[PDB]
Amino acid sequence: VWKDADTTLFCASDAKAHETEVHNVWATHACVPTDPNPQEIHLENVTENFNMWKNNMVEQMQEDVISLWDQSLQPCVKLTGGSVIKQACPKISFDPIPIHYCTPAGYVILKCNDKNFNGTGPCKNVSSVQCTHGIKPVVSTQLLLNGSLAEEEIIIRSENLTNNAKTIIVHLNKSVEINCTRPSNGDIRKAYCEINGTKWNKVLKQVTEKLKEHFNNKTIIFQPPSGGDLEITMHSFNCRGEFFYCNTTQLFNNTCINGTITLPCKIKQIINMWQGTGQAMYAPPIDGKINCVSNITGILLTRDGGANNTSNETFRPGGGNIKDNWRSELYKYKVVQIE
Ligand SMILES: CN1C(C)(C)CC(NC(=O)C(=O)Nc2ccc(Cl)c(F)c2)CC1(C)C
Ligand SMILES: *[C@@H]1O[C@H](CO)[C@@H](O)[C@H](O)[C@H]1NC(C)=O
Ligand SMILES: *[C@@H]1O[C@H](CO)[C@@H](O)[C@H](O)[C@H]1NC(C)=O
Ligand SMILES: *[C@@H]1O[C@H](CO)[C@@H](O)[C@H](O)[C@H]1NC(C)=O
Ligand SMILES: *[C@@H]1O[C@H](CO)[C@@H](O)[C@H](O)[C@H]1NC(C)=O
Ligand SMILES: *[C@@H]1O[C@H](CO)[C@@H](O)[C@H](O)[C@H]1NC(C)=O
Numbered sequence: 266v267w268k269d270a271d272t273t274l275f276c277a278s279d280a281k282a283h284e285t286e287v288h289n290v291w292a293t294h295a296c297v298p299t300d301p302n303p304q305e306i307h308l309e310n311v312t313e314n315f316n317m318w319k320n321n322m323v324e325q326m327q328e329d330v331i332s333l334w335d336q337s338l339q340p341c342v343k344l345t346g347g348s349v350i351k352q353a354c355p356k357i358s359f360d361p362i363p364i365h366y367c368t369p370a371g372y373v374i375l376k377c378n379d380k381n382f383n384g385t386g387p388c389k390n391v392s393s394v395q396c397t398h399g400i401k402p403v404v405s406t407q408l409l410l411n412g413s414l415a416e417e418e419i420i421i422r423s424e425n426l427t428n429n430a431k432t433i434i435v436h437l438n439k440s441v442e443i444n445c446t447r448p449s450n451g452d453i454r455k456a457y458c459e460i461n462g463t464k465w466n467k468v469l470k471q472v473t474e475k476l477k478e479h480f481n482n483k484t485i486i487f488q489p490p491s492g493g494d495l496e497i498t499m500h501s502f503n504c505r506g507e508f509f510y511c512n513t514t515q516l517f518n519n520t521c522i523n524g525t526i527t528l529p530c531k532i533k534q535i536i537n538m539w540q541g542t543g544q545a546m547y548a549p550p551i552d553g554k555i556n557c558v559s560n561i562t563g564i565l566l567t568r569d570g571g572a573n574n575t576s577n578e579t580f581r582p583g584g585g586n587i588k589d590n591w592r593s594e595l596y597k598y599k600v601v602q603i604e
């Protein structure tokens with residue numbers, strides 16, 4: 266017998282104590298080794314309600330990632346609340362590793378195994394586990410990278426679809442590779458991302474058909490972000506310690522919905538910190554080829570308001586709230602206390 270509850274989680278990883286890579290260094294001091302023989306108990310005739318949008322596991326992961334970035338990625342100049350911090354900004358080894366979240370004694374994690382589970386409401390196939398699967402703390406906007414895929418159909422997630430102010434998470438069931446490169450040797454901040462247009466347009470077409478099921482067969486239209494900070498209007502992510510900002514206008518092409526799509530990107534030193542600590546200037550890029558190949562496994566969308574009297578619904582790539590990134594992986598878990 267159990268009940269919904271929050272508690273202090275701990276983390277587990279397969280980090281190497283000899284690695285200089287910052288995620289390894291953090292997890293070495295902050296996490297324990299993973300369980301080689303994880304146990305999972307499938308419950309019968311159990312109905313449990315879940316709510317990915319109000320899940321304390323998300324806040325805790327956010328706190329971990331903030332801590333990790335604080336100890337690892339130091340900008341040359343910090344501009345937080347009037348005060349200005351000048352400090353050293355060495356180039357680091359950066360590559361996210363899977364982090365597992367685990368409950369202490371007296372608590373268990375319930376896992377929803379329904380194939381079409383949207384993140385909220387009752388779940389019929391529930392199991393109890395001691396730790397979540399390995400989740401890479403990938404910080405990005407617009408596109409969710411290196412995540413897990415939906416096992417069956419594409420899933421649409423939202424706290425309230427009728428509320429256009431609520432972010433929509435699209436969970437893909439098939440990944441699409443995005444290949445980003447800052448050439449070696451010139452504009453040292455110029456870069457680009459390559460995507461297979463055939464693969465992407467097919468997936469995007471399926472996303473539209475899925476959105477139709479949720480919006481009463483209205484016509485689905487994609488548009489580039491209306492405005493805001495560069496972190497929102499562009500697909501921003503971190504590759505090898507360098508902050509990439511990529512223009513995704515070509516990705517959401519309504520006409521296409523087959524060749525290589527090349528997105529124009531820039532490496533930026535001056536960034537609005539996702540932690541919410543204001544603005545910061547990081548160090549200039551390293552020399553040589555800077556390359557990251559990632560799997561697109563999710564999309565963050567914001568729906569246009571004021572379209573009730575039309576047959577169209579307009580969706581733009583957006584987001585910015587990094588907690589949503591963790592929600593896209595933590596949606597199927599919740600903590601309960603055992604009695
Ligand atoms: C709290 N708040 C929210 C989350 C509400 C929105 C917004 N978010 C970002 O500016 C942001 O996420 N930037 C960013 C930076 C680097 C990378 Cl790599 C990236 F992906 C994104 C501003 C702040 C103040 C942080
Ligand atoms: C629930 O999961 C079981 C396997 O654990 C499966 O046999 C069953 O079809 C699932 N029920 C649903 C979601 O229809
Ligand atoms: C998720 O499922 C719940 C319960 O069936 C439902 O109320 C809600 O509308 C669904 N959300 C989405 C995004 O389909
Ligand atoms: C990228 O996607 C492929 C196909 O789903 C997968 O085999 C590979 O492990 C993924 N790489 C990751 C998760 O970084
Ligand atoms: C992804 O989901 C869609 C329905 O949303 C389905 O038609 C398609 O077969 C799925 N793709 C794969 C490879 O399972
Ligand atoms: C969802 O959003 C709509 C529009 O803001 C609102 O009228 C409605 O009350 C919301 N539904 C819930 C369950 O809060």
Ligand SMILES: *[C@@H]1O[C@H](CO)[C@@H](O)[C@H](O)[C@H]1NC(C)=O
Pocket residue numbers: 444445446459558
């Ligand atoms: C990434 O793109 C570069 C060319 O821009 C290419 O040399 C490399 O093979 C690509 N990587 C993958 C995984 O296709």
Ligand SMILES: *[C@@H]1O[C@H](CO)[C@@H](O)[C@H](O)[C@H]1NC(C)=O
Pocket residue numbers: 461462463464
């Ligand atoms: C792009 O993806 C398609 C499958 O959708 C594949 O057949 C084709 O080889 C890919 N293009 C390249 C250049 O790899």
Ligand SMILES: *[C@@H]1O[C@H](CO)[C@@H](O)[C@H](O)[C@H]1NC(C)=O
Pocket residue numbers: 477478479480481482
């Ligand atoms: C969309 O149209 C199909 C016919 O292809 C219909 O069966 C279905 O009920 C419609 N869905 C919605 C949500 O309006």
Ligand SMILES: *[C@@H]1O[C@H](CO)[C@@H](O)[C@H](O)[C@H]1NC(C)=O
Pocket residue numbers: 498499512513514
């Ligand atoms: C993306 O590129 C298009 C085409 O050049 C341009 O019109 C648009 O302003 C760019 N978006 C951003 C946010 O820079």
Ligand SMILES: *[C@@H]1O[C@H](CO)[C@@H](O)[C@H](O)[C@H]1NC(C)=O
Pocket residue numbers: 514515516518519520521
């Ligand atoms: C959308 O695709 C069409 C078809 O090639 C292309 O001509 C156009 O440039 C694209 N629109 C964009 C990315 O603004």
Ligand SMILES: *[C@@H]1O[C@H](CO)[C@@H](O)[C@H](O)[C@H]1NC(C)=O
Pocket residue numbers: 361403410411502503504505556557558559560
């Ligand atoms: C995604 O995972 C791949 C394979 O581990 C890695 O090379 C790439 O840098 C990752 N992308 C991001 C943005 O972390």
